[PDB]
């Protein structure tokens, strides 16, 4: 996986009611929800109002897949919009999902790195037009 | 143990990622996602804004640090520049920008004599700029060892020796060789399972303590050649031990980490938006030291604590940010 911070050009041109809404998110690449191609689904939220987590797991439909940092930051940016802030929000790949889980896991936690991906302008669209 | 709150503050909008004191300890400045730097004068027992820098960065402050005499302030931003701000005129204006990272800059630390400043960035690159002159900067180094975001980077205490921390879970050492007086990486300090957010000296720079996304923190000790704990002293290079590790006692990433200069007091901040105070005992092993919890504020703020930094003049006195927008000034009493 490349730095989540960047896009390439290309590309540019309870548990029910979060799946409710990450469900629809339109993949960044092929004309189907994130729900369509199986990469959401609601039996991999986990979410602890006891404790203000919300856990989720994302299936990449290639172990290779190019545009999974993109897809996380796209879940989070969401859920960043819609859930009160006292939300602890964890995105991650779902085990043995993808050869670079562990690398597109760490990016997606950093709380730095995300902030600085939604400040590149180019990147903040593409985001924009996937969670609408 | 006291941990007691005196002021809150907030001025910025949104996030507030960094708090700094000036070497004089009745002034701070403060930077966010708002592109402002805030100036707070103090005036009897109340905290206000005497000035707001903006329009230096077109992105995120992500850090600032004011220069050990007082009169220059460098603000290091995601917009891949380091301002320097200096009273030319004047009030603050921006005399100097040091561009050269391809990156986010996500640090900046000044040299004891004011004389060395250095950044790193997210490029995995450490910049280390001389200061000749009323506002401009030469480069003097670009040491590129890391493998990663570089994090953050803070110099010795006493002597011309540089500390950064990384995302590729590491801790690096620069110092100058002799002979050809480059700047060369004297140590690699590895003990770490994730990211290093934060390091801070000891009073004499002879220990470091570090803080991790991997939820501890660590102390590590510097051995010289003619060392009595037995430690091989390889090319009689001081090398950098893990000599504890603080486990357990926070449940997220912690993002930063001060070491009282005047107390030896160590003050944490936390993803999980507490802010914990440790000590060295009374009884402590040097080379296996023991570092306690000797007060906590697990509720010090309403989000993720984003920075502390113990007032260089005020002994007890502690500043801290929070992503829930506000500023915090503490006053600790053991």
Redesign the interface.
């Given at each position: 996986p490349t730095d989540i911070e960047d896009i390439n050009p290309n590309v540019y041109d309870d548990k029910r009611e979060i799946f409710d809404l990450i469900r629809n998110i339109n993949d960044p690449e092929h004309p189907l929800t994130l729900e369509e191609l199986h990469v959401v689904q609601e039996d991999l939220i986990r979410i602890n109002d006891s404790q203000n987590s919300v856990h989720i797991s994302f299936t990449p439909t290639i172990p290779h897949c190019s545009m999974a940092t993109l897809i996380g930051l796209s879940i989070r940016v969401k859920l960043l919009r819609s859930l009160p802030p006292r939300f602890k929000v964890t995105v991650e790949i779902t085990p043995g999902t993808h050869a670079s889980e562990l690398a597109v896991n760490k990016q997606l936690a950093d709380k730095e790195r995300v902030a600085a991906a939604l400040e590149n302008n180019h990147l903040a669209e593409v985001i924009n037009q996937c969670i609408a | 143990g006291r941990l007691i709150l005196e002021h809150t503050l907030q001025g910025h909008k949104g996030r507030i990622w960094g708090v700094a004191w000036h070497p004089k300890g009745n002034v701070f400045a403060s930077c966010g996602?708002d592109k402002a730097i805030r100036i707070w004068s103090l005036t009897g027992n109340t905290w206000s804004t005497k000035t707001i820098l903006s329009d230096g960065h077109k992105?995120?402050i992500?850090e600032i640090r004011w220069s050990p005499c007082g009169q220059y302030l460098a603000s290091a931003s995601?917009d891949a520049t380091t301002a320097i701000w200096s009273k030319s005129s004047g009030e603050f204006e921006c005399n100097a920008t040091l561009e050269g990272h391809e990156?986010?800059v996500?640090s900046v630390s000044w040299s004891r004599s004011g004389g060395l400043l250095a950044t790193c960035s997210?490029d995995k690159s450490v910049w280390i700029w001389e200061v000749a002159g009323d506002d401009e900067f030469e480069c003097a180094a670009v040491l590129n060892p890391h493998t990663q975001?570089v994090?953050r980077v803070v110099w010795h205490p006493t002597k011309d020796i540089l500390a950064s921390a990384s995302?590729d879970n590491t801790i690096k050492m620069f110092a100058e060789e002799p002979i050809d007086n480059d700047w060369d990486c004297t140590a690699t300090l590895t003990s770490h399972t994730?990211?290093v957010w934060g390091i801070d000296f000891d009073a004499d720079g002879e220990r470091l303590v570090s803080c991790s996304?991997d939820t501890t923190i660590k102390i590590w000790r510097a051995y010289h050649p003619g060392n009595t704990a037995g430690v091989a002293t390889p090319d009689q290079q001081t090398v950098w031990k893990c000599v504890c590790t603080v486990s357990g006692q926070h449940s997220?990433?912690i993002y930063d980490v001060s070491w009282c200069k005047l107390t030896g007091l160590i003050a944490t901040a936390c993803?999980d938006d507490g802010i914990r105070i440790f000590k060295e005992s009374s009884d402590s092993k040097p080379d296996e030291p023991t570092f306690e919890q000797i007060t906590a504020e697990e509720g010090a703020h309403?989000?993720?604590v984003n920075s502390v930094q113990w007032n260089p003049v005020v002994a007890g006195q502690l500043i801290s940010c929070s992503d829930?927008g506000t500023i915090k000034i503490w006053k600790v009493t053991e």
């Open positions: - | 996602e992105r995120t992500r995601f990156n986010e996500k997210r975001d994090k995302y994730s990211t996304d997220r990433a993803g309403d989000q993720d829930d």
